Design a protein around this ligand. Structure first.
Ligand SMILES: [Cl-]
Lengths: 319, 317
């Protein structure tokens, strides 16, 4: 009792550790809500938190994991009584504040999202930050004019977390989806998620009514060449390094919008709206996208996402 | 008198591009009359063989940035084997997709010893660009002991030729392409390994130089795996839109970006590059060149435009 396991990253005098070890209740930082973590997931950002030069974590003894789903053990009066299934993504979690790769997490009441009717904690983590990023992107495109009747929608990080999830969300909304990836042997998978066409990495001059780029932008010059007049691109994520900028001219000439999607600091009112959508009209096909691993299998998954060999979504069952 | 030529034309009804017979009066002014033996198909030539290819602006025109043949009449220091590359040859002044071509002597380069007319065109603009690239890199300090050289030209004209050239030069070459069927082909040119950005493994400084023949398309990923001091030779055009780079990576590692212009290259260097092309920069053309007749030219022009031509293709008139 009061002694549980967590993936911990450390950095002393020219030495780096990253493994599952046992930690205590007192190692958890200041919070007003105590949560027993049922699930977490693996994100690329979480991969960067597991390595020294990742440029995410800037403080030593740390518990990564930007994603959380579980049950309230104890807390305060922030609208949370024990036994409540709560979700926690974004903010300082897994970056500045101890995160979800732990059996227990201690957080601020202002960061929790009461689990919407229509989602399991596992399904909530299967979606995770990635799904939130995908949902917000589509949400944002839709208030900007996107409907299935405007034309096909391109998605470029198709096999990754955000990409797989977006394809699914768009296909189930009735959109004609074209998906692009850089790995062959990924085509069948993309079609199963509902993509009508799949593109090998590389009508005249205006095919897509909208696009979703979850790779920091880095295929923007490709996406801009075949954008319809009035279209938009929702961009999010990181590349891998090596920034890829765009010219501005193509946005001006075709009246196209670039919508920066940030899942970290999204305000609570919108956050709640997105989670309602994720429980209803933007609920993806998690059975064909997500796979589950245990806390002890986590190190390997963080290596893989960093190397770019993780497809779809990976949820971590805690304990 | 009345010879054959490939003619592009565009009125206010249609666009015509076929092989018609034109006379001596159709060629524009020039002091040197060259009877063309060989020409070459180039990406640039394909754009000039089409409407919305933004290269040919005046109406009735004969494309072909590349010229090689024998002199009929001249008044500049007859029967001289000569090559013409770049300048106004593909673009503003009538080209080499014609049995005869009139040009100015300022563009002409006497065909170097150790090279054939067909070989000069197997090389052509593409080979020149590549050779001029390598050259520009070597005078920046690049040598085989600095580390491997990362081409990206792959099966572009330029690039295929770059690999062969660097391989024959003794460099370790890493070639990049997106087509899975050209892997065996790139090793025969002499590339040590074929590449299919990730931040594990350690790829963080491993290329001494780079040849980027797609308008700096791949600069963004190249730059973050350059050795401290290296350079990158960029040339040609992209498939369409322009892809910018950040400047930080250059300052950070003391890397240079070298703009390679084949079009308006100065004569003094032009000869030096061609002498090199007849010398230690002679690519193994046995594997990289192909030959077609004039009546077959339009077909290749259609293929290069849709990226269906590997290596180099010459033309016999
Ligand atoms: Cl559970």
């Amino acid at each position: 009792m009061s002694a549980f396991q967590a993936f911990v990253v450390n950095k002393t005098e020219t030495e780096f550790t990253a493994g599952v070890q046992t930690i205590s209740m007192d190692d958890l930082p200041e919070g007003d809500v105590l949560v027993r973590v049922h699930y977490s997931s693996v994100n690329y950002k979480d991969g960067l938190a597991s390595i020294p030069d990742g440029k995410i974590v800037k403080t030593x003894p740390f518990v990564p994991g930007i994603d959380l789903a579980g049950v309230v053990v104890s807390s305060q009066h922030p609208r949370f009584r024990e036994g409540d299934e709560v979700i926690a993504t974004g903010y300082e979690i897994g970056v500045t504040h101890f995160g979800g790769y732990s059996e227990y997490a201690r957080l601020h009441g202002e960061w929790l999202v009461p689990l919407p009717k229509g989602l399991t904690l596992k399904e909530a983590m299967a979606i995770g930050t990635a799904g939130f990023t995908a949902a917000l992107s589509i949400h944002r495109l839709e208030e900007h004019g996107l409907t299935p009747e405007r034309g096909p929608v391109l998605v470029t990080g198709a096999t990754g977390g955000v990409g797989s999830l977006a394809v699914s969300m768009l296909a189930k909304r009735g959109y004609t989806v074209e998906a692009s990836t850089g790995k062959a042997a990924e085509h069948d998978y993309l079609r199963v998620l509902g993509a009508k066409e799949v593109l090998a990495r590389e009508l005249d001059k205006q095919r897509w009514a909208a696009a979703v780029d979850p790779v920091g932008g880095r295929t923007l010059a490709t996406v801009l060449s075949r954008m319809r007049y009035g279209g938009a691109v929702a961009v999010s994520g990181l590349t891998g390094g090596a920034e890829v900028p765009t010219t501005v001219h193509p946005f001006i000439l075709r009246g196209v919008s670039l919508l920066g999607i940030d899942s970290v600091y999204c305000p609570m009112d919108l956050r709640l709206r997105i989670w309602e959508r994720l429980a209803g009209d933007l609920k993806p096909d998690l059975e064909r996208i997500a796979q589950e691993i245990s806390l002890a299998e986590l190190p390997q998954a963080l290596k893989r996402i960093l190397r770019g060999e993780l497809r779809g979504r990976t949820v971590v069952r805690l304990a």
